[PDB]
Structure formats: structure tokens, C-alpha cells
Design a binder for this molecule. Structure first.
Ligand SMILES: CC(=O)N[C@H]1[C@@H](O[C@@H]2O[C@H](C[C@@H](O)[C@H]3O[C@@H](n4ccc(=O)[nH]c4=O)[C@H](O)[C@@H]3O)[C@H](O)[C@H](O)[C@H]2NC(=O)/C=C/CCCCCCCCC(C)C)O[C@H](CO)[C@@H](O)[C@@H]1O
Ligand SMILES: CC(=O)N[C@H]1[C@@H](O[C@@H]2O[C@H](C[C@@H](O)[C@H]3O[C@@H](n4ccc(=O)[nH]c4=O)[C@H](O)[C@@H]3O)[C@H](O)[C@H](O)[C@H]2NC(=O)/C=C/CCCCCCCCC(C)C)O[C@H](CO)[C@@H](O)[C@@H]1O
Ligand SMILES: CCCCCCCC/C=C\CCCCCCCC(=O)O[C@H](COC(=O)CCCCCCCCCCCCCCC)COP(=O)(O)OC[C@@H](O)CO
Ligand SMILES: CCCCCCCC/C=C\CCCCCCCC(=O)O[C@H](COC(=O)CCCCCCCCCCCCCCC)COP(=O)(O)OC[C@@H](O)CO
Lengths: 368, 374
């Protein structure tokens, strides 16, 4: 089709724009103190933080210019245009919130409230355009359905965020997921539901190419860091395409390593097991590779429920406790390291991307 | 009406939210090093910058929560066009808040800022086309694509028109509040007239803006405890451009922009770099007096091109610019011009004077609109 072709053109041009603009603005970011040190590397220099903003900005630009082409000589259909503009509002709000958060370092409560408020537009569009709240069981979920979507949105913004820390991972898994969703959209295009999946494509192709431009700089050695800007941006874009596309189940299935990491980290997130500020592997100076990390805490003080959960985990061979208590920091990165010992940062990132691809293949096998 | 009542309620709640949250987040801003030095006082301390974002944030929140209330049981056919007007306008405003915040953090160049103003203005034009589409000026000529240009530039004007008229305390938020209040009165008067949907839309976007900006002014007033920054400048300008464009009273609105239009044109020679343009063209405080005096731009005459010398000679002829002899030319901004007309004025008094002049401009606009005695 012409719309998809134009979309691809502007998407490639936007990729070029991102790759070009990142270094042009480096001085700006550095002067603004928007930078962070590579915690998993020996050098202690600063590295541009919240680079996603540039990519994010470009992304918006692209869509802002691409809105008209689907409607060339098309009683105008205000509802599809409403879907587009509302989705763009949600995404823009989320990019803006991520950039703000990185500069300001907001507490978790602030984060969650702003996530919900910025997620409302998705519910607006969904209600006005589609507004179906029934799941096969056939039970009509009602208001709770909206809640679900809401939560889903939040999840997508924060899940990708917590599965981070090693060089190049964030944008990498984001790209794998985006590509899988693109393939799924193209397959289902010939099927019964075609408009939903071409919408998902409209939003996915430019995201894919811009995120690629960002990963170009973010790959090991990381010359830049993407930050909450990008994390929340990608999360919300995925939530949008999945919700308005009516394949949130397939998407969540694409979110397998993310879901597993989130649930695995759930005791720390809820303060059951003490949650350090940074829960990433520790580079061993001698090895030249990433070992696991631990949470050290006074044993007796811990709540009873926490001790019980930790004992269950030790029974299941998930946590390598060294009883003070030194529990193994529970993130997917550290779990891969525990199963396969010390791994180089680049190699570990690559392994994680490959596992994501395997999850996508499993999902495709389930659907088909 | 129920929607306007709910709007007023949530607007007052948002005013409280702003006045409360502004000081609460000061630690975040300071720690992030987002602050500026108060150039018009002897103190050297830092003041949190871009606090407008907070207001902006609250603003968005309010409208995100207010979108449903206009449509209550609004028949199986929902009107997507009023809804898209709302949503597109909010996309533009949010994009603009975001642009101002990122610009204050990054200190972007003029080219970058203007380009992004255009790109963030596109949603407004999309809404206008899909919903209204009229491109005829009653002067009766079809402007065609140029109308879309006009609105575009108009948007890009507003965002910047408030930004350049700044520097003293409370001028940005103050003039923005005067404008918003006058536009609210205009919307209410015209509410009972022929065009009710356009003006109730203007109200929807104006009332919460007025009250959140009031929350910001509470702290921004002299002595300034906060700075609003490009975030608030762009946010306000773009909200105004939205209500005016989609409200179909851009002429009346521009008439409300009399101080800002005059200050923009009067600054035009320096903006175009014909006459050398300093990075800050604010009135220089006098340490002895304690009042604000004019500021000049010093430069070698030889470098100055023929056109610049001509403009300067014309200005001197009209008694608009003071020139001494290298050569120094009075900085051209409405603040410096009022100081030329009235000599030294204290900071607070000068701010209040500019607000009063803004009120007079609004009154003139009402007289012209309704053919009333001045
Ligand atoms: C707690 C946690 O996981 N923290 C992570 C999380 O922390 C966030 O970090 C961010 C910064 C981090 O990226 C730093 O790592 C450095 N870095 C990054 C790459 C790199 O290659 N090298 C490098 O040095 C680099 O300096 C960079 O500043 C940020 O501060 C967040 O505020 C911080 N916490 C959260 O988001 C909490 C977000 C709260 C999430 C709430 C979840 C709610 C979901 C509910 C859904 C449900 C209701 C449906 O991500 C970090 C990634 O490194 C982890 O180290 C850290 O352990
Ligand atoms: C050039 C100019 O006007 N500069 C101004 C303009 O410059 C901007 O300044 C800002 C900084 C200013 O807020 C500082 O003043 C201090 N301050 C602030 C309040 C206060 O109460 N007390 C105080 O001390 C405080 O430290 C604060 O950091 C900012 O850097 C902008 O990027 C800067 N450039 C522009 O606007 C360019 C704007 C480009 C204009 C583009 C116009 C194009 C319009 C075209 C329309 C057409 C298409 C129809 O605004 C300043 C306001 O103070 C002036 O000092 C300065 O002289
Ligand atoms: C529509 C979404 C738009 C997204 C906007 C993106 C820009 C983001 C930048 C700044 C956020 C500023 C306003 C955020 C308001 C969020 C609302 C909120 O969190 O308020 C809490 C409600 O109870 C209380 O908080 P409080 O201060 O009492 O806690 C202590 C605190 O001072 C510690 O720093
Ligand atoms: C839709 C609007 C959203 C607004 C987003 C707000 C958030 C802001 C954050 C990042 C913006 C960064 C990219 C903005 C895109 C702007 C694109 C742009 O201006 O390109 C210019 C013209 O072509 C040339 O450029 P260039 O670098 O070569 O000039 C030299 C330069 O390096 C001097 O520092």
C-alpha cells in the first residue's frame, strides 16, 4: 500500500536523523549535567544520559508529518484520526515524563501517578472508538477491563525499565519485541482483522527504526545511555499498539523475559526482600567479566513473610543465599549469571537478546 | 452548565495542587542543577528554573481528567470531532511544555527551537483542517494554503512573543494571566452570541490555564522564589494560539497581544542580528539607587552595516532609541523603552506598570470589538 510505503520512507529518514543528531547535541547534554558513569566498566567518565529524548523527539516528528498520508482523499473519518492523535498524545506525554524523571529523579509514587494520568488517553480512545470489555470465559469484565489496560500500560513502561543495566540491553530487547510485533501484524494483515494490525504497523515501523538509530550509539561500548525517557517511551508505544490493536494477549506473550524478570523481582519491589538502589551484576576487576550481585541485610529484623518467601526461593534453587544474610539480587541478568557463571557484558547482552528471540518464536508457535 | 462548573472546580483544585507542589519539588530541581541566577538583584544565590513544568504538568492532568465531562450521554453516534479538537489541542500543548523543559535543560539554539515549534504546531493545523477547514479572510479572499501558514506562524509567534518580553519578576506569568483573563471575559460575553462552541472550547482550555498559572505566579512574584522559564513561555503562547485558532478569533486575540506585538517588532532589528543582540537584554539594576535603569548594546560602528546605521538613525529621529558615542545603542525591548520614557523604576513597580499597560491594551481591544467609549 501507499501509506505503509511512505511510512517506511519517513522511517528510514528518521533513522538517519537520529544517528546524525545524537552526536550533534552531545555538548548540550554534557553541559546540562545529564550524564551518568558506566557502572559496569573500569573507566569513570560521564556518558550522555536520557539520549532517548532525541530519538523520542524524532519519533514524534515522523508521526506528526505522516498523519495525513493514510487519509489522502478519505464525511471525514474522525475516529481513526482520533485514535492516531490520542496515541501520539500518550506517547509524547510518556517521553516527556521520562526525560523529566531522569533530570529530576522522582520517587516511585510520583512515577506511578504520572504513568496513570498519562495512560488515561489510551482508555479515552479505546472507549470512544472500540469500547469492548468482554473476554472469553464469555464474561463481560466491565470497568475492570479498563483497569487491566491501565495496569498493562504501567507494566509496559516499567517492565522494560527494570530489565536494564548492562550495555545495550534496553534498546535491544525493545527492538526484538517491536520486530516480532511487526511480523505478527504483517501475518494478520491478510486475515480478518487488518485495520488494527496496519495501525500497529503505523506505530511500530518508525519506532523500530528510531530505536535502531539509538541502539547504534548504545551498543557496547556504550557511548550513550537511553534512560527512563526511552524505557517509558517504548513501554507505552507497545501498550498502545497492543491495546488498540486488540492483541494484548499476544503482546504479553512477547513480553516473556520481561514478565519473568518482573515477577522474579517482585519481592524486592514490594520491599519483602531489601531492594538495593542498583541490582545489576558486579564486574570483577580480575576476571574481566560480570559476576552476580547480592543484598546484605540483618537477618533477624526481616519480616516473617519475607523470611518464608526467601526460604521457598532457596528451596527452589533460585537464590544463592550465603547466610547477616547475603541474598542474591533477583533480576534476570543475575539469574542468567548464576546459571551460567560469569559472562562478559557484551556476551551477556547478546545472550539475553537471543533468549528474547526464542520467547518470540515460542509465542508464534502458540498462536500458529 | 455542568461542564464549566466541573471545569472551575478542577481548576481551583489544580491551583491548590500547583501552589503546593511547586515548593515540594524544589529539592529535585536544585539537585539537578536546574536553576538560574537572579540577574536583577545583588544576591548571587540560585533560583529553581523551569518550575512552569510543574504547572504545565498539573495543567495536563486537569484536562486529562476533564475530557469526559463535556460528553455525558453524547444516541449511539458519539461525536469524534469535538473530541479530536480537544485531544489534538492537548497534544500540541503537551508537546510544547515538553519542548520548553528540554530546551531549558539543554539550552538549544534558535534554529532548533523554531523548527520544533513548527513541528509541535502541526497537530493544531491538523485539527483545524479536519474539523473546520475554512481558509477565507473577510478583507473576502480565499487565503488557501497561506491561511495554514498564517495560523502556523501565529502559533510560533505566541510561544516566542511572551518569551522575549521577560526578565523582570512576574512579567511572564503576569502578562499571561492578564491575557488569559481578558480572553475568558471575551469568551463569556460571546458565549451567548452566535459562536458558542468555539468560545466554550476556549473557556475549557483557558480557565484551568489561568488558575494553574496563578499558582505559579504565587511563587514567581517579586521577590522571585521561582522562575517559570521557556517551559511556561511556550506552554502559555501555544495554549493561547490554540484557543484563538480553534476558537476563530485570532484577530481579537492578537489585539490582546498589543504589548507583546509592539515589543516583538521593536526588538526585531536585534533579533535579526542587524544591530548586535546581547544574550540578555534586561534592565541593568543600579547598586546605589536600587532601581532598574536602561541597558545598552556597545559595538564598533565600522562593523555596523549601512542598513543598521539607517535603522538606528531613523529610531533616533523618532526619539525611540538613545544613542551615545565605538557606539552604544539603547537595547530595544518594551521594558527598556518604558525605562527610557520614565527613567529609573524599581523592579516591582516596573512589573506592575507593564501589567497595567497590558490591562489598558485589553480595554482598548474590548472597545474596538464592541464599539464602546474609551
Ligand atoms: C527497582 C529496580 O528495579 N531498579 C533498577 C532500575 O533502576 C532505575 O535506574 C535508572 C537509572 C539507571 O539506568 C542507571 O544505570 C546506569 N547504567 C545504565 C546502563 C548502563 O549500561 N550502564 C549503567 O551504568 C546509568 O547510570 C543509569 O543512570 C533510574 O535512576 C530509575 O529511577 C531507577 N529506578 C526505577 O526506575 C524504579 C522503578 C520502579 C518500578 C515500579 C514497577 C511497578 C510495575 C507495576 C505493574 C503492575 C501494577 C501491572 O534500573 C537499573 C538499570 O541499571 C537497575 O540497576 C536498578 O536496579
Ligand atoms: C533575543 C532575546 O529576546 N533574549 C531575551 C530572552 O532570552 C531568553 O532568556 C531565557 C533565560 C532567562 O529566563 C534568564 O533571565 C533570568 N531571569 C529570569 C527571570 C527573572 O525574573 N529574573 C531573571 O533574572 C534567569 O537567569 C533566566 O535564566 C532563556 O535562556 C532563553 O533561551 C533565552 N533566549 C530566547 O528567548 C530566544 C528567543 C528567540 C526569539 C525568536 C522570535 C521568532 C518569532 C518569529 C515569529 C514569526 C514567525 C511570526 O529572554 C530573556 C528574559 O530575561 C531576556 O533577558 C533576553 O534578552
Ligand atoms: C499528564 C502527565 C504529565 C506528565 C508531566 C511530566 C513532567 C514531570 C515533571 C515534574 C512532575 C511535577 C508534578 C508531578 C505531580 C505528581 C503528583 C504527586 O506525586 O503528588 C503526590 C500526591 O500525594 C504528593 O507529592 P509530594 O510532593 O507531597 O511528595 C513529597 C515530595 O515533595 C518529595 O519530593
Ligand atoms: C514534535 C516536536 C517535539 C519537540 C521535542 C522536544 C524535546 C527536545 C529534545 C531533543 C530535540 C533534539 C532534536 C530536535 C530536532 C531538530 C532538528 C534540527 O534542528 O536540524 C537542523 C536543521 O536541519 C540542523 O541541525 P544540526 O544539529 O546539524 O545543527 C548544528 C547543531 O549541532 C548545533 O548544535
Amino acid at each position: 500500500p501507499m501509506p505503509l510505503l511512505i511510512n517506511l520512507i519517513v522511517s528510514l529518514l528518521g533513522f538517519v536523523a537520529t544517528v546524525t543528531l545524537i552526536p550533534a547535541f552531545r555538548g548540550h547534554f554534557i553541559a546540562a549535567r545529564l550524564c551518568g558513569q558506566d557502572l559496569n566498566k573500569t573507566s569513570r567518565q560521564q556518558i550522555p544520559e536520557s539520549q532517548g529524548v532525541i530519538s523520542g523527539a524524532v519519533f514524534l516528528i515522523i508521526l506528526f508529518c505522516f498523519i495525513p498520508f493514510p487519509f489522502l482523499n478519505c464525511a471525514f473519518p474522525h475516529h481513526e484520526f482520533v485514535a492516531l492523535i490520542g496515541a501520539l498524545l500518550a506517547i509524547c506525554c510518556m517521553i516527556f515524563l521520562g526525560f523529566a524523571d531522569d533530570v529530576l529523579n522522582l520517587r516511585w509514587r510520583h512515577k506511578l501517578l504520572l504513568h496513570t494520568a498519562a495512560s488515561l488517553p489510551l482508555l479515552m480512545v479505546y472507549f470512544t472508538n472500540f469500547g469492548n470489555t468482554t473476554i472469553v470465559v464469555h464474561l463481560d469484565l466491565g470497568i475492570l477491563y479498563y483497569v487491566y489496560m491501565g495496569l498493562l500500560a504501567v507494566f509496559c513502561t516499567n517492565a522494560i525499565n527494570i530489565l536494564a543495566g548492562i550495555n545495550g540491553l534496553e534498546a535491544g530487547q525493545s527492538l526484538v519485541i517491536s520486530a516480532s510485533i511487526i511480523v505478527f501484524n504483517l501475518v494478520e494483515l491478510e486475515g480478518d482483522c487488518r485495520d488494527d494490525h496496519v495501525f500497529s504497523l503505523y506505530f511500530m515501523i518508525p519506532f523500530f527504526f528510531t530505536t535502531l538509530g539509538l541502539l547504534y550509539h548504545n551498543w557496547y561500548p556504550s557511548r550513550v545511555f537511553v534512560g527512563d525517557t526511552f524505557c517509558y517511551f517504548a513501554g507505552m508505544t507497545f501498550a498502545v499498539v497492543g491495546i488498540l490493536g486488540h492483541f494484548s494477549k499476544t503482546m504479553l506473550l512477547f513480553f516473556m523475559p520481561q514478565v519473568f524478570n518482573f515477577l522474579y523481582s517482585l519481592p524486592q519491589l514490594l520491599h519483602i526482600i531489601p531492594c538495593p538502589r542498583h541490582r545489576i551484576p558486579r564486574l570483577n576487576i580480575k576476571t574481566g567479566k560480570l559476576e552476580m550481585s547480592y543484598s546484605k541485610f540483618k537477618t533477624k529484623s526481616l519480616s516473617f513473610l519475607g523470611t518464608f518467601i526467601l526460604k521457598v526461593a532457596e528451596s527452589l534453587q533460585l537464590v544463592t543465599v550465603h547466610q547477616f544474610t547475603e541474598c542474591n539480587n533477583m533480576t534476570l541478568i543475575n539469574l542468567l549469571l548464576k546459571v551460567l557463571g560469569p559472562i562478559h557484558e557484551r556476551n551477556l547482552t547478546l545472550l539475553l537478546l537471543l533468549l528474547q528471540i526464542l520467547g518470540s518464536a515460542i509465542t508464534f508457535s502458540i498462536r500458529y
